[PDB]
Amino acid sequence: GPPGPPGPPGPPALPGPPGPPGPPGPP
Amino acid sequence: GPPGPPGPPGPPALPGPPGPPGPPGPP
Amino acid sequence: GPPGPPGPPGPPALPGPPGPPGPPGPP
Ligand SMILES: [Zn+2]
Ligand SMILES: [Zn+2]
Numbered sequence: 001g002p003p004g005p006p007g008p009p010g011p012p013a014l015p016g017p018p019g020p021p022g023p024p025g026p027p
Numbered sequence: 028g029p030p031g032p033p034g035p036p037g038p039p040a041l042p043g044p045p046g047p048p049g050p051p052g053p054p
Numbered sequence: 055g056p057p058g059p060p061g062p063p064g065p066p067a068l069p070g071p072p073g074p075p076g077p078p079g080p081p
Contacts, residue, residue, distance in 0.1 A: 001028075001055055002055045003028055003055040003056050003057070003058055003059070004028030004029045004030055004031060004055060004056065004057050004058035005029075005030045005031065005058045006030070006031055006034075006058050006059055006060070006061050006062070007030050007031035007032045007033050007034060007058060007059070007060050007061030008030070008033050008034065008061045009033065009034050009061050009062050009063070009064050009065065010033050010034035010035045010036050010037060010060075010061060010062070010063050010064030011033060011036045011037060011064045012037050012064055012065050012067055013036065013037035013038060013039060013040050013064065013065070013066055013067035014040065014067050015040055015067050015068050015069070015070055016039070016040030016041045016042050016043060016067065016068065016069045016070035017042050017043070017070045018042065018043050018046075018070045018071055018072070018073045018074070019042045019043030019044045019045050019046060019070060019071070019072050019073035020042070020045045020046070020073045021045065021046055021073050021074045021075070021076050022045050022046035022047045022048045022049060022072075022073060022074070022075050022076035023045070023048045023049065023076045024048075024049050024076045024077050024078075024079060024080075025048055025049030025050045025051050025052060025076055025077065025078045025079035026048070026051050026052070026079045027051070027052050027079050027080060028055050028056050028057050028058060029057055029058065030057075030058050031057055031058030031059045031060050031061060032060045032061070033060070033061050033064070034060050034061030034062045034063050034064055035060070035063045035064065036063075036064050037063065037064035037065045037066055037067060038063070038066055040066065040067035040068060040069055040070065041069040041070070042069065042070050042073075043069050043070035043071045043072050043073060044069075044072050044073070045072070045073055046072045046073035046074045046075050046076065047072065047075045047076065048075070048076050049075055049076035049077045049078050049079060050078050050079070051078070051079045052078055052079030052080045052081055053081055
C-alpha cells in the first residue's frame with residue numbers, strides 16, 4: 001500500500017496579547 | 028502505515044485593539 | 055507503506071482583548 005495518511009492539522013495558535021494602552025484622557 | 032505527525036503550528040495571533048480612553052483631567 | 059508525512063499548518067487564533075486604559079487627562 002501507499003504511504004500512511006498525512007498527519008492532522010498542526011496545533012492551534014494561542015490568542016493574541018492585549019492591545020496597546022488606550023488614549024490618554026481628555027483635558 | 029500510520030498517519031504522520033501533526034502539521035506545523037498555527038501562525039502567531041494579533042494584538043487586541045487599543046484599550047479604553049482614560050478619564051478627564053481635573054475640572 | 056511508511057508512516058505518513060506531517061499534516062497541514064495549524065489554524066490561526068483570535069486577536070487579544072483590548073489593552074489597558076489610558077491615564078487621566080492632565081491638570
Ligand atoms: Zn505498499
Ligand atoms: Zn503501510
